[PDB]
Amino acid sequence: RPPLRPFSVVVASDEKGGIGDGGTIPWEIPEDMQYFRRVTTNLRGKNVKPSPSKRNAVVMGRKTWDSLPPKFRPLSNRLNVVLSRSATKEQLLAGIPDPIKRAEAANDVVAVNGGLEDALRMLVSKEHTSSIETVFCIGGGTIYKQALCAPCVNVLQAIHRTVVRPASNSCSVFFDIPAAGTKTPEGLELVRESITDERVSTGAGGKKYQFEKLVPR
Ligand SMILES: NC(=O)C1=CN([C@@H]2O[C@H](COP(=O)(O)OP(=O)(O)OC[C@H]3O[C@@H](n4cnc5c(N)ncnc54)[C@H](OP(=O)(O)O)[C@@H]3O)[C@@H](O)[C@H]2O)C=CC1
Ligand SMILES: Cc1cc2c(cc1C)N1C(=NC(N)=NC1(C)C)N2
DSSP: OOOOOOOEEEEEEOTTOEEESSSSOSOOOHHHHHHHHHHHHOOSSTTOOOBTTBEEEEEEEHHHHHHSOGGGSSOTTSEEEEEOSSOOHHHHHHTOSSHHHHHHHGGGEEEESSOHHHHHHHTTSTTTTTSEEEEEEOOOHHHHHHHTSTTGGGTOOOEEEEEOSSOOTTOOEEOOOOTTTOOOSSSOOEEEEEEOOOBOOSSSSOOOBOEEEEEEO
Protein backbone atom coordinates (compact mmCIF):
# COMPACT_ATOMS: atom_id res chain seq x y z
CA ARG A 1 0.00 0.00 0.00
CA PRO A 2 2.33 2.83 -1.25
CA PRO A 3 1.30 6.50 -1.97
CA LEU A 4 -2.22 7.42 -3.19
CA ARG A 5 -4.20 10.37 -4.56
CA PRO A 6 -5.60 13.12 -2.26
CA PHE A 7 -9.33 13.55 -2.84
CA SER A 8 -12.18 15.40 -1.13
CA VAL A 9 -15.69 14.27 -0.34
CA VAL A 10 -19.02 15.73 -1.43
CA VAL A 11 -22.26 14.92 0.39
CA ALA A 12 -25.72 16.31 1.14
CA SER A 13 -27.11 14.89 4.36
CA ASP A 14 -29.82 15.82 6.84
CA GLU A 15 -29.11 16.19 10.58
CA LYS A 16 -29.36 12.40 11.06
CA GLY A 17 -26.67 12.23 8.36
CA GLY A 18 -29.16 10.41 6.08
CA ILE A 19 -28.38 10.72 2.37
CA GLY A 20 -30.66 8.44 0.30
CA ASP A 21 -33.92 6.45 0.35
CA GLY A 22 -32.63 3.37 -1.47
CA GLY A 23 -31.91 4.39 -5.08
CA THR A 24 -33.02 8.01 -5.41
CA ILE A 25 -31.38 10.89 -3.54
CA PRO A 26 -34.24 12.15 -1.28
CA TRP A 27 -33.78 15.85 -2.09
CA GLU A 28 -33.26 17.85 -5.29
CA ILE A 29 -32.53 21.20 -3.55
CA PRO A 30 -31.62 23.47 -6.52
CA GLU A 31 -28.76 25.53 -5.12
CA ASP A 32 -27.46 22.33 -3.52
CA MET A 33 -27.38 20.58 -6.89
CA GLN A 34 -25.85 23.78 -8.30
CA TYR A 35 -23.01 23.77 -5.78
CA PHE A 36 -22.35 20.09 -6.48
CA ARG A 37 -21.97 20.83 -10.17
CA ARG A 38 -19.70 23.82 -9.70
CA VAL A 39 -17.65 22.08 -7.02
CA THR A 40 -16.83 18.89 -8.92
CA THR A 41 -16.56 20.42 -12.41
CA ASN A 42 -14.70 23.71 -11.92
CA LEU A 43 -10.90 23.86 -12.14
CA ARG A 44 -8.66 26.39 -10.35
CA GLY A 45 -7.67 29.77 -11.79
CA LYS A 46 -9.32 32.60 -13.75
CA ASN A 47 -11.59 31.61 -16.66
CA VAL A 48 -10.16 28.06 -16.63
CA LYS A 49 -12.47 25.47 -18.23
CA PRO A 50 -12.67 21.61 -17.96
CA SER A 51 -11.58 19.76 -21.08
CA PRO A 52 -10.51 16.05 -21.34
CA SER A 53 -7.03 17.62 -21.17
CA LYS A 54 -7.69 18.76 -17.60
CA ARG A 55 -10.77 18.07 -15.46
CA ASN A 56 -11.69 16.67 -12.04
CA ALA A 57 -12.46 13.07 -11.26
CA VAL A 58 -15.46 11.85 -9.37
CA VAL A 59 -15.34 8.42 -7.73
CA MET A 60 -18.53 6.60 -6.77
CA GLY A 61 -19.71 3.09 -5.97
CA ARG A 62 -21.81 1.13 -8.48
CA LYS A 63 -25.01 1.61 -6.47
CA THR A 64 -24.59 5.37 -6.57
CA TRP A 65 -24.07 4.91 -10.30
CA ASP A 66 -27.43 3.14 -10.46
CA SER A 67 -29.08 5.97 -8.50
CA LEU A 68 -27.77 8.61 -10.93
CA PRO A 69 -30.85 9.97 -12.79
CA PRO A 70 -30.30 8.74 -16.41
CA LYS A 71 -29.76 12.33 -17.54
CA PHE A 72 -26.95 12.67 -14.96
CA ARG A 73 -25.40 9.44 -16.22
CA PRO A 74 -22.59 10.18 -16.61
CA LEU A 75 -21.76 13.46 -14.90
CA SER A 76 -20.54 15.50 -17.82
CA ASN A 77 -17.16 17.22 -17.88
CA ARG A 78 -15.76 14.88 -15.24
CA LEU A 79 -13.97 11.55 -15.31
CA ASN A 80 -16.57 9.26 -13.74
CA VAL A 81 -14.81 6.55 -11.77
CA VAL A 82 -17.07 3.73 -10.68
CA LEU A 83 -16.06 1.07 -8.15
CA SER A 84 -17.69 -2.28 -8.77
CA ARG A 85 -16.67 -5.84 -8.04
CA SER A 86 -18.87 -7.41 -10.71
CA ALA A 87 -19.72 -4.95 -13.53
CA THR A 88 -17.47 -3.87 -16.42
CA LYS A 89 -17.15 -0.62 -18.32
CA GLU A 90 -19.55 -2.37 -20.67
CA GLN A 91 -22.05 -3.13 -17.89
CA LEU A 92 -21.83 0.38 -16.53
CA LEU A 93 -22.59 1.96 -19.93
CA ALA A 94 -25.61 -0.36 -20.25
CA GLY A 95 -27.20 1.84 -17.58
CA ILE A 96 -27.19 4.67 -20.16
CA PRO A 97 -30.60 4.42 -21.95
CA ASP A 98 -29.83 6.58 -24.97
CA PRO A 99 -27.44 4.34 -26.97
CA ILE A 100 -25.85 7.30 -28.80
CA LYS A 101 -24.92 9.25 -25.69
CA ARG A 102 -23.83 5.84 -24.38
CA ALA A 103 -21.22 5.51 -27.11
CA GLU A 104 -19.94 9.04 -26.41
CA ALA A 105 -19.64 8.47 -22.65
CA ALA A 106 -17.01 5.75 -22.79
CA ASN A 107 -14.44 8.56 -22.96
CA ASP A 108 -15.12 9.72 -19.42
CA VAL A 109 -16.23 6.49 -17.73
CA VAL A 110 -13.93 4.07 -15.94
CA ALA A 111 -14.78 0.86 -14.10
CA VAL A 112 -12.31 0.29 -11.30
CA ASN A 113 -12.50 -3.29 -10.06
CA GLY A 114 -11.72 -2.53 -6.43
CA GLY A 115 -12.30 -0.26 -3.44
CA LEU A 116 -11.46 3.41 -2.95
CA GLU A 117 -7.82 2.76 -2.05
CA ASP A 118 -7.57 1.03 -5.42
CA ALA A 119 -9.12 3.96 -7.31
CA LEU A 120 -6.82 6.37 -5.45
CA ARG A 121 -3.91 4.09 -6.33
CA MET A 122 -4.80 4.48 -10.05
CA LEU A 123 -5.28 8.23 -10.05
CA VAL A 124 -1.81 8.74 -8.58
CA SER A 125 -0.44 7.75 -12.02
CA LYS A 126 1.29 10.15 -14.44
CA GLU A 127 -1.71 10.29 -16.79
CA HIS A 128 -4.14 10.96 -13.96
CA THR A 129 -1.89 13.56 -12.30
CA SER A 130 -2.04 15.81 -15.34
CA SER A 131 -5.31 15.15 -17.13
CA ILE A 132 -7.10 15.16 -13.77
CA GLU A 133 -6.74 17.98 -11.27
CA THR A 134 -8.88 17.16 -8.25
CA VAL A 135 -10.50 13.98 -7.02
CA PHE A 136 -13.86 13.92 -5.27
CA CYS A 137 -15.45 11.05 -3.41
CA ILE A 138 -19.14 11.48 -4.21
CA GLY A 139 -20.80 8.51 -2.50
CA GLY A 140 -22.54 6.34 -1.81
CA GLY A 141 -22.80 4.83 1.69
CA THR A 142 -20.05 2.17 1.89
CA ILE A 143 -17.74 4.33 -0.22
CA TYR A 144 -18.01 7.18 2.25
CA LYS A 145 -17.42 4.87 5.24
CA GLN A 146 -14.33 3.65 3.38
CA ALA A 147 -13.09 7.17 2.67
CA LEU A 148 -13.05 7.82 6.42
CA CYS A 149 -11.16 4.55 6.91
CA ALA A 150 -7.40 4.15 6.96
CA PRO A 151 -5.62 4.25 4.69
CA CYS A 152 -7.99 6.43 2.64
CA VAL A 153 -8.61 9.03 5.32
CA ASN A 154 -4.82 9.54 5.30
CA VAL A 155 -5.12 11.60 2.09
CA LEU A 156 -8.60 12.93 2.60
CA GLN A 157 -8.20 16.70 2.29
CA ALA A 158 -11.65 18.21 2.95
CA ILE A 159 -15.31 17.25 3.30
CA HIS A 160 -17.90 19.48 1.62
CA ARG A 161 -21.03 18.64 3.57
CA THR A 162 -24.35 20.28 2.81
CA VAL A 163 -26.99 20.42 5.54
CA VAL A 164 -30.65 19.94 4.68
CA ARG A 165 -32.41 21.53 7.68
CA PRO A 166 -35.74 19.56 7.60
CA ALA A 167 -34.27 16.05 8.03
CA SER A 168 -36.00 13.40 5.94
CA ASN A 169 -37.44 10.57 8.02
CA SER A 170 -37.34 8.14 5.07
CA CYS A 171 -33.58 7.75 4.65
CA SER A 172 -32.43 4.13 4.34
CA VAL A 173 -28.82 5.12 3.56
CA PHE A 174 -26.59 7.17 5.89
CA PHE A 175 -23.18 8.85 6.11
CA ASP A 176 -21.60 7.96 9.48
CA ILE A 177 -19.90 11.32 10.27
CA PRO A 178 -18.78 11.50 13.94
CA ALA A 179 -20.00 14.99 14.98
CA ALA A 180 -17.40 17.58 13.90
CA GLY A 181 -14.69 17.43 16.57
CA THR A 182 -15.01 13.99 18.13
CA LYS A 183 -11.96 11.76 18.60
CA THR A 184 -13.38 9.16 16.22
CA PRO A 185 -13.42 5.41 17.02
CA GLU A 186 -10.66 5.50 14.36
CA GLY A 187 -8.79 8.52 15.71
CA LEU A 188 -9.87 11.31 13.38
CA GLU A 189 -10.83 14.79 14.47
CA LEU A 190 -13.20 16.35 11.96
CA VAL A 191 -12.88 20.12 12.08
CA ARG A 192 -15.42 22.62 10.77
CA GLU A 193 -12.95 24.85 8.93
CA SER A 194 -15.96 26.92 7.87
CA ILE A 195 -19.72 26.84 7.28
CA THR A 196 -22.10 29.13 5.37
CA ASP A 197 -25.04 30.89 6.93
CA GLU A 198 -28.37 29.09 6.62
CA ARG A 199 -30.31 29.93 3.46
CA VAL A 200 -33.69 28.66 2.31
CA SER A 201 -34.47 27.02 -1.04
CA THR A 202 -36.50 29.48 -3.13
CA GLY A 203 -38.28 26.56 -4.82
CA ALA A 204 -41.45 24.99 -3.40
CA GLY A 205 -38.72 22.67 -2.20
CA GLY A 206 -38.50 25.24 0.61
CA LYS A 207 -35.96 23.46 2.81
CA LYS A 208 -32.88 25.16 4.28
CA TYR A 209 -29.32 24.38 3.26
CA GLN A 210 -25.85 24.98 4.66
CA PHE A 211 -22.43 24.62 3.10
CA GLU A 212 -20.30 23.11 5.85
CA LYS A 213 -16.63 22.26 5.29
CA LEU A 214 -14.89 19.74 7.53
CA VAL A 215 -11.21 18.81 7.62
CA PRO A 216 -9.16 16.06 9.36
CA ARG A 217 -7.09 16.94 12.45
N1 LIG B 1 -26.76 12.67 -0.92
C1 LIG B 1 -25.55 12.38 -1.39
O1 LIG B 1 -24.59 13.14 -1.25
C2 LIG B 1 -25.36 11.12 -2.13
C3 LIG B 1 -26.32 10.15 -2.05
N2 LIG B 1 -26.15 8.88 -2.55
C4 LIG B 1 -27.12 7.80 -2.20
O2 LIG B 1 -26.40 6.68 -1.72
C5 LIG B 1 -27.19 5.47 -1.89
C6 LIG B 1 -26.28 4.32 -2.28
O3 LIG B 1 -25.41 3.94 -1.15
P1 LIG B 1 -24.62 2.53 -1.07
O4 LIG B 1 -25.60 1.40 -1.08
O5 LIG B 1 -23.56 2.56 -0.02
O6 LIG B 1 -23.86 2.50 -2.47
P2 LIG B 1 -22.33 2.70 -2.81
O7 LIG B 1 -22.27 3.92 -3.66
O8 LIG B 1 -21.51 2.65 -1.56
O9 LIG B 1 -22.09 1.40 -3.70
C7 LIG B 1 -21.48 0.24 -3.10
C8 LIG B 1 -20.96 -0.65 -4.20
O10 LIG B 1 -19.62 -0.24 -4.57
C9 LIG B 1 -18.89 -1.36 -4.99
N3 LIG B 1 -17.74 -1.50 -4.10
C10 LIG B 1 -17.63 -1.00 -2.83
N4 LIG B 1 -16.47 -1.28 -2.28
C11 LIG B 1 -15.79 -2.01 -3.24
C12 LIG B 1 -14.51 -2.60 -3.25
N5 LIG B 1 -13.66 -2.54 -2.23
N6 LIG B 1 -14.15 -3.26 -4.37
C13 LIG B 1 -15.01 -3.32 -5.40
N7 LIG B 1 -16.23 -2.80 -5.50
C14 LIG B 1 -16.57 -2.15 -4.38
C15 LIG B 1 -19.83 -2.55 -4.96
O11 LIG B 1 -20.45 -2.48 -6.23
P3 LIG B 1 -20.88 -3.90 -6.84
O12 LIG B 1 -21.31 -4.82 -5.70
O13 LIG B 1 -22.04 -3.54 -7.75
O14 LIG B 1 -19.68 -4.46 -7.58
C16 LIG B 1 -20.79 -2.12 -3.85
O15 LIG B 1 -22.08 -2.72 -3.83
C17 LIG B 1 -28.32 5.85 -2.87
O16 LIG B 1 -29.57 5.94 -2.19
C18 LIG B 1 -27.93 7.24 -3.37
O17 LIG B 1 -29.06 8.05 -3.68
C19 LIG B 1 -25.05 8.62 -3.35
C20 LIG B 1 -24.12 9.53 -3.59
C21 LIG B 1 -24.15 10.88 -2.97
C1 LIG C 1 -24.26 11.50 -7.49
C2 LIG C 1 -24.62 12.56 -6.68
C3 LIG C 1 -23.73 12.88 -5.66
C4 LIG C 1 -24.03 13.87 -4.81
C5 LIG C 1 -25.13 14.62 -4.98
C6 LIG C 1 -26.03 14.33 -5.94
C7 LIG C 1 -25.81 13.30 -6.84
C8 LIG C 1 -26.79 13.08 -7.83
N1 LIG C 1 -25.16 15.53 -4.01
C9 LIG C 1 -23.91 15.58 -3.51
N2 LIG C 1 -23.53 16.54 -2.58
C10 LIG C 1 -24.38 17.61 -2.32
N3 LIG C 1 -23.98 18.55 -1.45
N4 LIG C 1 -25.66 17.65 -2.95
C11 LIG C 1 -26.16 16.64 -3.94
C12 LIG C 1 -26.39 17.34 -5.27
C13 LIG C 1 -27.54 16.10 -3.50
N5 LIG C 1 -23.33 14.41 -3.83
